[PDB]
């Protein structure tokens, strides 16, 4: 089969411009018309971005382009939006009921302003309560940068390997979301009075703390 | 116009076989054949394991086939294996400028646990729902697969007006955890009357309902 040529990554800048690339060959790319640029939001399912060369599908809004003098063949993205970081692959079609495919650019929209997560930290509910057990957490949307160190304070104290958080991603597109769970004892949360999450991203922390109060 | 509900999950085990389904409307999916699969896995440019439906794209194993009943689609691969968790893909075509995929799927066979996550409705507290702002979260724990799709509703209506998903990050124990972050401020919150978070799971579909309240 051999394979095909796109890049793996391309740098823009927020409200920029995008040149994609694709190196095929004389069957493809190289000979024949029946090219693709496909938009992953990266976690979603592909969804072409310009078909047929620059053949811009429903709503597919057009600062993208087809393009290319050969074998070789290119698609520009005039001015970024950030939603415009995805993955960006290309593909020609073959010789017949068959095409290829490959890797790449606009994937990089700096210009992206940095912010910071607003934690939101939640005690267990009632049912779970009622149920006889807890799990404790803290939640972390509007930021940027994801690369959070988030932490477990217990009456004023380090927690230690009771409590799981993962690697947060994307909102709409934009930037992340994060939520660390401290699974426990009613029993021990029930004794202990403090109750506080933190994150620690870029410099600044923000904690957030729960004590047997409410209601619920 | 893009409308595919292909299954979220499909359960690898060792030698096996599987199978998905995929599905939109009557007009394309019913009236007509039209939706081709992929493979994609692990970041890579997907592939091509149907290609028209009854046929596969040549130097493809004939394991894997299409199905639809005609309302929707099916697929199968006969054999389970480890070059198979990959991301499944598909599309119907469409108006020169549609042409739509299904979200994806997913495969598996090692060394692989089998059970089922663990979905938690915390509506919001009182210094939230306190000025201007709520949220709700429900997160999805341990899970041993963890392609869990998440939804919420209140009062019986669906949304996604509404909510961003936390993708099942990792609990080192190899197991799985997710969230569901849905704001509405205040408004919805207490401009309904319950609500709910709910999440099926390869063969599994457990819900979350819930309610309001004054607090105290």
């Known amino acids: 089969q051999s394979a095909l040529t796109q890049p793996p990554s391309a740098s823009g800048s927020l409200g920029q411009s995008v040149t994609i690339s694709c190196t095929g060959t004389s069957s493809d790319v190289g000979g024949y018309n029946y090219v693709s640029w496909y938009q992953q939001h990266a976690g979603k399912a592909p969804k072409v971005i310009i078909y047929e060369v620059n053949k811009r599908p429903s709503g597919v809004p057009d600062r993208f382009s087809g393009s290319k003098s050969g074998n070789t063949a290119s698609l520009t993205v005039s001015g970024l939006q950030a939603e415009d970081e995805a993955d960006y692959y290309c593909?020609?079609?073959?010789?017949?009921?068959?095409?290829?495919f490959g890797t790449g650019t606009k994937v990089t929209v700096l210009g992206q302003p940095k912010a910071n997560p607003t934690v939101t930290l939640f005690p267990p509910s009632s049912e779970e309560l009622q149920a006889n057990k807890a799990t404790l957490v803290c939640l972390i949307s509007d930021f940027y940068p994801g690369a959070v160190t988030v932490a477990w304070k217990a009456d004023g104290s380090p927690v230690k390997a009771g409590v799981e958080t993962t690697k947060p991603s994307k909102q709409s597109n934009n930037k992340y979301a994060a939520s660390s769970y401290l699974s426990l004892t009613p029993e021990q949360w029930k004794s202990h009075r403090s109750y506080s999450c933190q994150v620690t991203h870029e410099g600044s922390t923000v904690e957030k703390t729960v004590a047997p109060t409410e209601c619920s | 116009?893009?409308?595919?509900?292909?299954?979220?999950?499909?359960?690898?085990?060792?030698?096996?076989?599987?199978?998905?389904?995929?599905?939109?409307?009557?007009?394309?999916?019913?009236?007509?054949?039209?939706?081709?699969?992929?493979?994609?896995?692990?970041?890579?440019?997907?592939?091509?394991?149907?290609?028209?439906?009854?046929?596969?794209?040549?130097?493809?194993?004939?394991?894997?086939?299409?199905?639809?009943?005609?309302?929707?689609?099916?697929?199968?691969?006969?054999?389970?294996?480890?070059?198979?968790?990959?991301?499944?893909?598909?599309?119907?075509?469409?108006?020169?400028?549609?042409?739509?995929?299904?979200?994806?799927?997913?495969?598996?066979?090692?060394?692989?646990?089998?059970?089922?996550?663990?979905?938690?409705?915390?509506?919001?507290?009182?210094?939230?729902?306190?000025?201007?702002?709520?949220?709700?979260?429900?997160?999805?724990?341990?899970?041993?697969?963890?392609?869990?799709?998440?939804?919420?509703?209140?009062?019986?209506?669906?949304?996604?007006?509404?909510?961003?998903?936390?993708?099942?990050?990792?609990?080192?124990?190899?197991?799985?955890?997710?969230?569901?972050?849905?704001?509405?401020?205040?408004?919805?919150?207490?401009?309904?009357?319950?609500?709910?978070?709910?999440?099926?799971?390869?063969?599994?579909?457990?819900?979350?309902?819930?309610?309001?309240?004054?607090?105290?």
């Open positions: 593909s020609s079609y073959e010789g017949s009921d068959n095409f290829v």
